[PDB]
Amino acid sequence: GAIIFSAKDIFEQEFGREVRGYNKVEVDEFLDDVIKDYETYAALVKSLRQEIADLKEELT
Amino acid sequence: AIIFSAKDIFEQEFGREVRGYNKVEVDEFLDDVIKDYETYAALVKSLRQEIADLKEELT
Amino acid sequence: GAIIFSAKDIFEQEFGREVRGYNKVEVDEFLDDVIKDYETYAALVKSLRQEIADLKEE
Amino acid sequence: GAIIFSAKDIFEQEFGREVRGYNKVEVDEFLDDVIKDYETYAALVKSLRQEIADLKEE
């Protein structure tokens, strides 16, 4: 299926306030790393598609 | 350079503070993040297979 | 990256030839319409994602 | 209505014969992936429009 979130969306996500909700620093630092993972995967899919496209064109 | 698996997203726990984030909103957000990790993993898997097959065919 | 091609890739796509081939004008002009569908789909996803964002603000 | 073709239209498209025309395997297999993109876009749009109905209901 398609990807729900961009790395932009991950970063822009705001959460409402809740008394005794999750520690904001823990969630924020966690999503900081999740952002890096979205960027890596998005770039990895692009390079793989580019490799396929080059190989198909080679095959031609 | 991948830091997390979907397993790690699911297993991630957080402390609480008085001015915290709404826990349902976070958990419901991370449930979709898990879906995205697994979609990416499966998409990468299938692409690396298409690449291996094309390389076989180029020989 | 669940979408394989951009509209640019459709535009750039080249084919070799064979003896019992497909008519080049027919394929070409068909892909010129596929190109429009890719552009339309990309702009519709972009407009819908904007409606979703705005809705989160309200 | 602004989409010209359905994924099923892409599949059903026939091209006439041209001697030394385009390689059928290359065109067919290209269009197989175009099909997957029409299916993906159509699923995606539906899914975005559902989320919109969801946020309005909420």
Numbering used by the authors:
A (entry chain B): -1 to 0, 4 to 61
B (entry chain A): 0, 4 to 61
C (entry chain C), D (entry chain D): -1 to 0, 4 to 59
Question: What text appears in the publication on this structure?
Answer:
GpsB has emerged as a major regulator of PG biosynthesis in low G+C Gram-positive bacteria, and its homologues (DivIVA/Wag31/antigen 84) in Actinobacteria play essential roles in hyphal growth and branching. To gain molecular understanding of GpsB function, we report three crystal structures of PBP cytoplasmic mini-domains in complex with GpsB, the first structures of a PG synthase in complex with a cytoplasmic cell cycle regulator. The PG synthase arginine finger pokes into a negatively charged cavity situated between α-helices 1 and 2 of GpsB and is fixed in the same orientation in all structures, just as the phosphoryl group defines the binding orientation of peptides to 14-3-345. Therefore, the role of GpsB in the bacterial cell cycle is that of an adaptor, docking PG synthases to other cell wall enzymes, scaffolds and shape determinants into protein complexes for division (the divisome) and peripheral growth (the elongasome).
S. pneumoniae, more distantly related to either Bacillus or Listeria, is an ovoid-shaped Gram-positive coccus in which GpsB is essential. In S. pneumoniae, GpsB localises to mid-cell, the only region of active PG synthesis for both peripheral (side-wall) elongation and cell division in this bacterium. SpGpsB co-immunoprecipitated with SpPBP2a (one of three pneumococcal class A PBPs), SpMreC and other proteins, suggesting they interact at some point in the pneumococcal cell cycle. The importance of the SpGpsB residues involved in the interactions with SpPBP2a is also consistent with the phenotype because of the severe growth and morphological defects of S. pneumoniae strains harbouring the SpGpsBTyr23Ala, SpGpsBVal28Ala, SpGpsBAsp29Ala, SpGpsBLeu32Ala and SpGpsBAsp33Ala alleles even though the mutated proteins were still capable of self-interactions and were expressed at wild-type levels. Whilst the interactions of SpGpsB with SpEzrA and SpStkP were confirmed by BACTH, and observed with the reciprocal hybrid pairs, they were unaffected by any of the SpGpsB alleles mentioned above.
